[PDB]
C-alpha cells in the first residue's frame, strides 16, 4: 500500500490531474478554533495516498489549496462538514464542489441507522477500517506507521464509495436532493466556524 | 385592517404586482401527508391581507400558484420550512425565491433563545400576536372572525420584519450566510415530504 | 340550575335511561384499580341533568347501573374510558363492550393540537369551562361536598355533545372505521391494564 | 433447506393449501411511504420457503394477494404491525386474520424483556437467527445467498413458535386477550400508514 | 396567634406535659454536616407555638432534648426524615417515637401527586401556608416577624393533620403499614447522616 | 446434590437449623400477574431443595412452617421480591430475614455492582450463570440447566451472610442492617399493596 | 438614579479613585467569539452608574482598561466568568483582582437553589431587578431608556451585595474558599475563550 | 519491586526527589464515610511503596512530611479525590501538585476518554488492569493482585507528567494548567465541606 508522506504541502500536482480527489484531515480535536490542522490526506483513487503533515502555525499550502480551489475537481469527503471547516479556517479557502459520503449514506442507506465510514466500508466494499488511531497525537513530529495507515485508509476508498452511492441516488431518484445538500455543505461548515456549530439552523427549535 | 376572504383562489393579481409577498398557511395539523391545506394567507405589506379558503381535495389555485412560481417575487415566510412543504405537496409547485423570518432570527437575535413569531413581533414591532386560534378547526366551512383575524396577523407584519432582519444581517455581515440558508430551504421542505422530517441531514448523528 | 341527583349505592330505577347512549364517568381514591376503590359513578342521558352515585367501600352490587353497562343496545360514552372501564369491570365484574371514547376521538380528529384533555376539549368545542380543582379530592368521603358533586357531574354533562361533534369530524376526515376499531379494542386495553400490562404499549416494537 | 426464489409473484398456490402461512417482508427501510417493498417471504411450515422479489413500482401479485386475502388462512408474522403496513400500502389489501409472535411473546414471556425474533428463536427452539443481512440493500437486482437465507430464516420457524405461544396463552388463560390484540393489529398498521406511527392511540398522553 | 421566641432552649416543659408534640426545624440548608441547626419549633396543638433560636456551636438544649428522648411523647413531623437527621446530628439524641405527615400523605392521599405541607394544609384544613421565608437566612441574630410566623406555621397544624391522617389510615386499613414506616424513619435519617442520603437502600438499583 | 420436589418438602429433617437460604422463581416480576413457580432452599451444607409450585397451589405446610419459624433466619438475595411472592402465594410473611443485597449496599461501598453474580464472584470466586434466569419456570418438567441455576441461588447465601456479617461488624453498621431487615417485610407488603414504584421515604 | 452615558470610554477616572468598582457588560449574545461587546457598565457604589457604549470593532478604551488592570482595585461582578471573558477578548486585558456575587451566593446562600442576580437582590436588598431588557438589541446606536436603566441596575447594587456576602463568608468561615475561587475565576474565563466553555475542568467525567 | 509497609514509610531515603507519584485506596468514594486504607508512592524509579493505613489511624509522620514539603511536587491521577481523603485523614492538604487527568483534559483533545487506563495505553503502551479497583481495600492482608494494582497506579505518573508537560508547552497551555493545579486543593476542600456535587463555576 503506497503512502507518500510529505511535510507542509504536496511537492507538486503531478498525481492530481484528475476530476475528483478524495480528501480527509486529522487534527488535535473537534474544535477548529482550538484544535489545529495536523494532517491532510489525499487520494486520486488509484489505491495510493498522500499524507501531508501540517506544521503548527502553517498558513499556506499552495499545491493543496490549488486543488481545493479548483472548480473542475470534485472534493470527496466522508463527513465533509468537519474537513471543510478546518481546511477553510486554516488556509482561507472554502471548497465549493464537494461530495460527502455520510450525507449520501443518510439519503440512501435507509435500511440502517449506522452511517459511519467504518460501517459503510464494511457493507459496500467488505473493507475493514480500524479506528484505533483516530484518537492519537496527530501533532507528533513523526507519525507512527499505524497512524499513517489509518490516515490513508480514510481516503483510499472514497472514490469507490461515491460510485456506489451515485448508483443508489440514481435508483431512488434522489440526485437533485443530494446535489442541494452538497451545495449547502460549505455554508454549513461556515456556520460552524461562525458560532452555530451546535444549532440545526433549519429546526423549529 | 382590511381582510379580504376568498374561496379557492385570489380573483386576480391586481394587489400583487410587487417584488415580495408575505405568505402563510393553515392546515389540520403538522403532517402534510395526513393534514390537508385549509387556508393560504397573503399580504403585499400594505396593511391588508388576503385569506384564501382551500377546499378538501382542491387541486388548483392558478393565481396563487403563479405568485409562488414567479422568480421575480420573493416569498416571505415565518418558518417557511412548513409552509413550503404543504404548498408544494398540495399544488405541485415548490417556490424557490424565499425569505424566512425564523432562520433570520436565529442568525441575528443571538441575545435570546425565543425565535417564535409572537416573540419576534413583540420585540421588533411592539405588535401583539394572539395565538389562541392557531389550534382550531381550520377545515371549518366558515372560519370564525377570530380565526380570520389570526390568519391575517401571520402575514400582515412579515415585510416589516424582513426589513429589520435585513438591517441586522448587513450589520453583522451575515447576508451571504442567510442567502445560502434560504436557497437550501425549499430542499429542506422537500426532504420533509420525502421522509426525512425527523432527520437533521447535516448532523454527525 | 343544573339538576344533579345524588344516590347511595345505585340508581333507584332506569326511568331516565331508556336511551341509545349514556355518558359515564367515575371517581376513585386514585389511578390504581387494585389499590384505589371505586367511590362515585356519574351518569347523564344528555338532557343537561346528571346522576351521581356514591359507591360504598366493599360494595359488590349495583344492579341498575350494571344493567346499563351490560346492555349491548346502549353505547357507553366516556372521556378516557380506558380508566373507567377498568375500575368498573374490576368492581362489578362486568366489562362494557359498546363504547365511545372522546379522548381517542380527539386524538383521531384534533390533529392541530397536542392537548387532548377533557378541559381543553370542552373549552374549544363547546366554550364550556371545566374546573379541575376537585379531581384530586377525598372521593371516599361519606358526604361529598357541593364542589365535588358539581365537578363529578361536569364530567358527564357534555359527553353527548362532544360525541356528536367528534362524529362529524370522523366522518369529514373519513376515519369512522378507524375509530370503531379503536373503540372495539378499548375494553380489552382496560382488561390488559387490570391483568398487569398497564405500563406496556402492547403494539410497540419496544 | 429448500428456498424457492420467484420474481414478482408465486406461479400458483399449490404449496399453500393450508390453514396458516408464515409471512415476512424486506424493504429499503422502516417508512412505507418512502421505503419500497423489496421481498415477500412465505413458508407453509414444512421447512421450505418461498422468497419473492418485488420490483420497483410493482402494483399487483395476484397469487400472493389471494393468500393474504383468504380469511380461511391465518397469516403468521413476527411484528406484523410492520409487514401488514407495507403489504397493504403496496398491494392495497390488508390481511385481517393474523397471528403475531411478538405480541404473543409480550403476553407470555413475562420473565424477560427481550421479545425480538432472534431471542425468541433461541429460547424456544434453540435456533440461531443471524441478523447481519437485516440491514442490507434489499432492492438489489440479485439477492446474495446470505440475503436469501436470512430472508427465509424469518418465516421457517413461525409455525413452531405459534404452536408454543398458543400453549402458553392457554396455560395462562390469555387466549381471548391475544385474539383481541390480533383483531386490532391490522388497524394498528393502518393507523401507521395514515400518520399515527409515533402515537400510542390508547395512552393518556 | 401567640408565638413565644426563645434563645437556646425552652425555659421549662410546662406547656409540654402532653402525649404528642409537633416539631420542625430551620437550618442554613439541606446538608446537616454543612448546614447548622438554626431554629427548632414546637407546638402542643393548642394554637400557640414555641420558636427556639439555636446558636452556632450550641451543644445542649436540655428541655427540648428531654422531649425528644421521652418515649411517652410522640414527635410529629412533616418530612421528619430531615428534622430527625439535623436534630440527632446536633444534640446526639435520635427520637424513636414519631409520626410523619408526608409519609402519611403518601399512604392515604393516593388521588394526588402533591404531598408537600402547603398542599396538604390547603386541602385538609383550608389553611394557606406561605413559603416565601423557607429560603431565608435562618442564622440571623434577629429573625424577622415573617420568618417567625413562617417557622410557627410549620408546627401549628400538625396535630390536626395527624388526626385526619389517622382517620384515613384506619379507613383504608393501613395503620400497621404506617407504623412500620415510622419505626424505620429514625434509621432512614441515620442512614442519611452516615452517607446514604442519595440511596434508596431498598431499591434493586 | 439437588433434591427436586412437587408441591412441598416431604419433611423438615434437613432444616433443623438456625438459618435457611431461600429463593424463588416465577413467571415474572409482578406477583399479582406472575405466579410462583419454584421455591429453592438450602441448609448451607452444599445441597439444595428445589420445590415446584403448581398453578393455583394454595398451601405448602412444611415450607410455610419454616417461613413462619421465628427461630430460623431466612437468608435471601434481594428478599424484597421473594418475600412479596411468598406472602402473596401462601399468606405468610416471614419476619426474621437477612438480605445479601441490602448487606452489599451497606458494606461493598467500593463498587456500584450489587447483583448476586457480582457478589459471588468477588467474595467467593463462585461463577453464577444467569442464562436460565429468563426461562419458562412454569414448565411441568424443569430442564437440568434450570434446576442447577435455581439451586445456585441458594447454595452460597450462608457463606455470603458470614462475610457480610464480618463487614457489618468491622464498619460498625450492625444496628443499621438490623433495622433495614426489620422493615424489609413491610417493604414487600408495600409492593403488594400498590407502592411497588414508590420510595416511601423520598421527598418526591 | 444618575446614569451617565458615554460613547467609547469614560472621559476620565475622577469618579473611580476607589478600592472596588462594580462592573457589568452587555453583548449581542453568550458567545464572545461571535457576539461583540456592546456596553460596559460601571458604578462606584454611590448610587450612580456609567453606561459606556462600545462600537463595533472598537479596540481601545483606555480609562476603562486602566481600571481593569489596576491591581489595587477589586472588580466586582455578578457571574464574572462571562464579563471577564468578553472584556479580555475585546481589549486584551484580563482582570486578576475580582469578586463574584454568584460564586459568593453559591458559597453562602445554601438554603436556596436560586442564585441569579434578580433572586439575590430580592432577598438581600428587597430590590426588584426587571430582566425584560436582558434579551434586547444591545448593539443599537441609541439605547432605549429601559435598556439604559436595566444596564445600570446590574451594577448599582453590587457593592451592597459584596458587603453582605463578605459578612456571610466570615460567619460561616469560608473566606479562604471564596478567595481561591476568585483567584481562579480569570483562568476559568480564559478556559472558556480557549475552547473549554462546556467543560467542568475539575470533574471526573 | 513493591515494598509493603504498615502505617507509614520507615524513612524518606527513597524520596529525596523533586516530585513523588501518589495514589490512595479507600473503602469508597465518600471520604466522610469511607476510610483511607492504602497510600501508594513511587519515586519514578520503577519501584513503589504501598502503605496500609489502619482504621482510626490519625498520623503518618513520614508520609505527611512528603505531603507538606513545598519543594516536592505531588503527582496524582485525578488528585481531586486523593487530596480530599489525605487531607481529611491526616489534616494536611498538599499545595504543590500535578494531576494527569486535568493535564489530559487540557492536551488530549482528540479523545473523550481521560481515565488512567486509557492514558497509559495510548501514551506508554502500558496495560492497566482495573479488576482490583473495586475490592476490599480494608483487608488485613492485601492480595498480590491488590498490591500490584495499587502499585501500578503510581509506577507511571512520572513518565506521564513528562509527556503532558511536553504537550502543555507545545500547545502553550502551561499557565492554564498551573492555575488549575493551584486551585485543585481547594476544589478538594470544597468537596469535603459539602459541595462535592456542585461545579462552583457553573451558571447553574
H136, H138, H143, H149: best to mutate for the F interface, most F CBs within 10 A: H136
Question: How far, in Å, CA of B70 to CA of B96, rounded?
Answer: 9
CB contacts of G25 in chain B (<8 Å) are none
D193, D202, D203, D205: best to mutate for the C interface, most C CBs within 10 A: D202
CB contacts of G85 in chain A (<8 Å) are none
The answer to whether the Cβ–Cβ distance between A188 and B202 falls below 8 Å is yes
CA distance, residue C25 to nearest chain F CA (Å): 23
Going by C-alpha positions, the residue among H204, H200, H188 that lies closest to residue H102 is H188
Instruction: Find the CB nearest A103 among B81, B185, B201.
Output: B201
Instruction: Find the CB nearest E195 among H33, H193, H194.
Output: H33
* Whether B140 contacts B53, CB under 8 Å: no
CA distance, residue E35 to nearest chain G CA (Å): 8
The structure was resolved experimentally with X-ray
**How crowded is residue G29: how many other Cβ atoms within 10 Å of its Cβ?**
17
* Whether A6 contacts A26, CB under 8 Å: no
Q: Is A150 annotated as a binding residue?
A: yes
H, E, C per residue of chain A: CCEEEEECCCCCCCCCCCCEEEEEEEECCCCCCCCCEEEEEEECCCCCEEEEECCCCCCCCHHHHHHHHCCCCEEEECCHHHHHHHHHHHHCCCCCCEEEHHHHHHHHCCCCCCCCHHHHHHHHHCCCCCCCCCCCCCCCCCCCHHHHHHHHHCCCCHHHHHHHHHHHHHHCCCHHHHHHHHHHHHHHHHHHHHHHCCCCCCCCC
C-alpha cell at A178: 443530494
Question: How far, in Å, CA of B201 to CA of A185, rounded?
Answer: 10
CB contacts of C111 in chain B (<8 Å) are 28-31, 34-35
Output Rg (C-alpha) for chain E, integer angstroms. Answer: 16
Going by C-alpha positions, the residue among C100, C101, C110, C81 that lies closest to residue C169 is C110
C203, C204, C205, C206: best to mutate for the D interface, most D CBs within 10 A: C203
For G165-193, b/e burial (b = at least 16 CB within 10 A) is: beebbeebebeebbebbbbbbbbbbbbbb
The answer to whether the Cβ–Cβ distance between D205 and C116 falls below 8 Å is yes
CA distance, residue H17 to nearest chain A CA (Å): 30
Starting at the earlier edge strand, list the strands of the sheet with E3-7: E3-7, E49-53, E37-43, E20-27, E74-77, E98-100
Give the residue on C whose Cα is nearest the Cα of E111.
C30
Count the domains in chain F: 1
Going by C-alpha positions, the residue among G85, G87, G79, G94 that lies closest to residue G155 is G79
**First vs last C-alpha separation in chain C:** 51
* Whether E166 contacts E159, CB under 8 Å: no
Give the residue on D whose Cα is nearest the Cα of A106.
D29
Going by C-alpha positions, the residue among H97, H95, H100, H85 that lies closest to residue H157 is H100
**Looking at the DSSP assignment, which residues form a beta bridge with residue C11?**
none
A97: left (phi over 0), alpha (psi -120 to 50) or beta: beta
Going by C-alpha positions, the residue among F160, F165, F161 that lies closest to residue F118 is F160
G135, G140, G143, G146: best to mutate for the B interface, most B CBs within 10 A: G135
Q: Is H107 annotated as a binding residue?
A: no
Instruction: Find the CB nearest H34 among F109, F167, F170.
Output: F109
Contacting partners of chain B (3+ CB pairs under 8 A): A, C, D, G
Give the residue on F whose Cα is nearest the Cα of E203.
F199
> Mind giving me the DSSP string for G47-112?
S-EEEEEPPTT----HHHHHHHT-TTSEEEESSHHHHHHHHHHHHS----SEEEHHHHHHHH-TT-
Question: How far, in Å, CA of D199 to CA of D185, rounded?
Answer: 14
**How crowded is residue A12: how many other Cβ atoms within 10 Å of its Cβ?**
8
C-alpha cell at A163: 460510485
CA distance, residue E201 to nearest chain F CA (Å): 7
The answer to whether the Cβ–Cβ distance between E111 and C35 falls below 8 Å is no
The answer to whether the Cβ–Cβ distance between A139 and H113 falls below 8 Å is no
Give the residue on F whose Cα is nearest the Cα of E188.
F201
Question: How far, in Å, CA of F40 to CA of F147, rounded?
Answer: 10
Q: Estimate to the nearest angstrom the gap between the alpha carbon of E166 and the chain centroid.
A: 17
CA distance, residue H204 to nearest chain F CA (Å): 21
Helix (H) or strand (E) run with residue B74 in it: strand B74-77
CB contacts of E123 in chain C (<8 Å) are 136-137
What SS3 state is found at B42?
strand
Question: How far, in Å, CA of C9 to CA of C52, rounded?
Answer: 10
Helix (H) or strand (E) run with residue H119 in it: helix H116-124
Structural domain boundaries, residue A113: 1-205
CB contacts of A56 in chain H (<8 Å) are 170
Give the residue on G whose Cα is nearest the Cα of B106.
G29
CA distance, residue E99 to nearest chain H CA (Å): 29
Size of interface C-D (CB pairs under 8 A): 65
Helix (H) or strand (E) run with residue H196 in it: none
Contacting partners of chain G (3+ CB pairs under 8 A): A, B, E, H
CB contacts of C172 in chain B (<8 Å) are 56, 139
CA distance, residue E142 to nearest chain G CA (Å): 15
Parallel/antiparallel/unpaired status of strands F19-26 and E74-77: unpaired
CB contacts of E125 in chain C (<8 Å) are none
CB contacts of C196 in chain F (<8 Å) are 30, 32-34
Q: Cα–Cα distances in Å, from D169 out to A81, D174, E107, F89, G183? A: 53, 5, 36, 22, 70
Residue found under cell 508522506: A5
Residue found under cell 444596564: G151
The answer to whether the Cβ–Cβ distance between C30 and E123 falls below 8 Å is no
The answer to whether the Cβ–Cβ distance between D31 and A110 falls below 8 Å is yes
Question: How far, in Å, CA of D101 to CA of H76, rounded?
Answer: 56
Size of interface E-H (CB pairs under 8 A): 11
CA distance, residue G130 to nearest chain B CA (Å): 16
* Whether G73 contacts G66, CB under 8 Å: no
CB contacts of D86 in chain A (<8 Å) are none
Is chain H in touch with chain E: ≥3 Cβ pairs within 8 A? yes
Give the residue on C whose Cα is nearest the Cα of F29.
C196
CA distance, residue D196 to nearest chain B CA (Å): 9
CB contacts of H166 in chain A (<8 Å) are none
C-alpha cell at G150: 436595566
DSSP alpha helices (H): ranges in chain F?
61-68, 79-90, 100-107, 116-124, 144-152, 157-170, 174-190
Residues 6+ apart with CB under 8 A from E33: E89, E193, H32, H194
Question: How far, in Å, CA of G88 to CA of G77, rounded?
Answer: 14
Going by C-alpha positions, the residue among F121, F118, F80, F104 that lies closest to residue F161 is F104
* Whether B162 contacts B120, CB under 8 Å: no
Instruction: Find the CB nearest E28 among G111, G114, G123.
Output: G111
Q: Is B200 annotated as a binding residue?
A: no
**Looking at the DSSP assignment, which residues form a beta bridge with residue E24?**
E41
Contacting partners of chain A (3+ CB pairs under 8 A): B, D, G, H
* Whether C115 contacts B135, CB under 8 Å: yes
* Whether E61 contacts E88, CB under 8 Å: no
Q: Phi and psi at residue F37, in whole multiples of 5°? A: -115, -35
Amino acid at each position: 500500500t503506497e503512502i507518500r508522506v510529505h511535510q507542509g504541502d504536496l511537492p507538486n500536482l503531478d498525481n492530481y490531474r484528475i476530476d475528483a480527489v478524495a480528501v480527509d484531515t486529522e487534527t488535535l480535536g473537534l474544535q477548529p478554533h482550538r484544535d489545529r490542522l495536523c494532517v491532510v490526506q489525499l487520494s486520486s483513487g488509484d489505491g495510493t495516498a498522500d499524507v501531508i503533515q501540517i506544521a503548527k502555525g502553517q498558513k499556506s499550502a499552495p499545491n493543496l489549496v490549488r486543488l481545493l480551489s479548483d472548480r473542475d475537481i470534485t472534493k470527496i469527503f466522508h463527513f465533509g462538514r468537519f474537513d471543510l471547516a478546518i481546511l477553510a479556517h486554516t488556509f482561507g479557502v472554502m471548497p465549493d464542489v464537494v461530495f460527502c459520503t455520510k450525507i449520501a449514506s443518510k439519503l440512501t442507506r435507509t435500511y440502517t441507522d449506522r452511517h459511519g465510514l467504518k460501517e459503510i466500508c464494511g457493507e459496500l466494499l467488505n473493507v475493514n477500517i480500524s479506528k484505533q488511531q483516530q484518537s492519537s497525537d496527530w501533532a507528533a513530529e513523526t507519525l507512527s506507521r499505524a497512524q499513517i495507515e489509518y490516515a490513508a485508509s480514510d481516503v483510499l476508498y472514497l472514490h469507490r464509495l461515491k460510485d456506489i452511492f451515485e448508483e443508489r441516488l440514481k435508483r431512488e431518484e434522489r440526485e437533485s436532493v443530494a446535489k442541494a445538500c452538497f451545495q449547502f455543505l460549505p455554508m454549513r461548515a461556515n456556520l460552524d466556524l461562525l458560532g452555530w456549530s451546535e444549532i440545526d439552523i433549519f429546526a423549529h427549535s
